UniProtKB/Swiss-Prot annotation:
This is Oxidized purine nucleoside triphosphate hydrolase. GO terms for cellular component: cytoplasm; cytosol; mitochondrial matrix; mitochondrion; nucleus. 8-oxo-ATP binds at residues 26, 34-37, 51, 55, 116-119. Mg(2+) 1 binds at residues 35, 55, 99. It is an enzyme of class 3 (hydrolase). The gene is NUDT1. PROSITE patterns: NUDIX, NUDIX_BOX.
Length: 155
């Protein structure tokens, strides 16, 4: 099956994580990291930085690749190849964008019920400073039917 490149960025500080609420459309109200498609004409890391900046107004001094996840959807031939990054080196104050409303969450209050269902599986690994490869099969946007998570030394 064919695949397309995407990014996902977690701003993860010692005691808190930044998530953004999706403001627009039928998917509004879901809370998640920052990211989008990787464009022709930018690197994966360029795309991750661009989406972070566009969505939260933040720039970073460094991004660390912590995961790679393949998403498959029931009835959909195209796969998502998602490169997952973490940062604790943001260079300003999170601010609202057209698309996302950033908010800080304490690490004992991660809003899993209001996040993409896959986050419940891999975000715990990220908190343990583990790197991973993942695969998730979705029914629609709310349900996982199959998955695999593997700890790796190198992403
Ligand atoms: C609006 C920015 O949303 C960040 C995000 N977070 C997740 C997530 N936790 N899980 C996902 C599962 C399947 C498809 C996309 C996503 C996803 N996405 C969309 C994606 C393009 C992969 O970053």
């Amino acid at each position: 099956g064919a695949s397309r490149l995407y990014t996902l960025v977690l701003v993860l500080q010692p005691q808190r994580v930044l998530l953004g609420m999706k403001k627009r459309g039928f998917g509004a109200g879901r809370w998640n990291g920052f990211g989008g498609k990787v464009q022709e004409g930018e690197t994966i890391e360029d795309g991750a930085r661009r989406e972070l900046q566009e969505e939260s107004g933040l720039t970073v001094d460094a991004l660390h690749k912590v995961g790679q996840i393949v998403f498959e959807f029931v009835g959909e031939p195209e796969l998502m190849d998602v490169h997952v990054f973490c940062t604790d080196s943001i260079q300003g104050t999170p601010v609202e964008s057209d698309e996302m409303r950033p908010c800080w969450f304490q690490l004992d209050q991660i809003p899993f019920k209001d996040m993409w269902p896959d986050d419940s599986y891999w975000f715990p690994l990220l908190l343990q400073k583990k790197k991973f490869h993942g695969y998730f099969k979705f029914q629609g946007q709310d349900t996982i039917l199959d998955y695999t998570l593997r700890e790796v030394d190198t992403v």
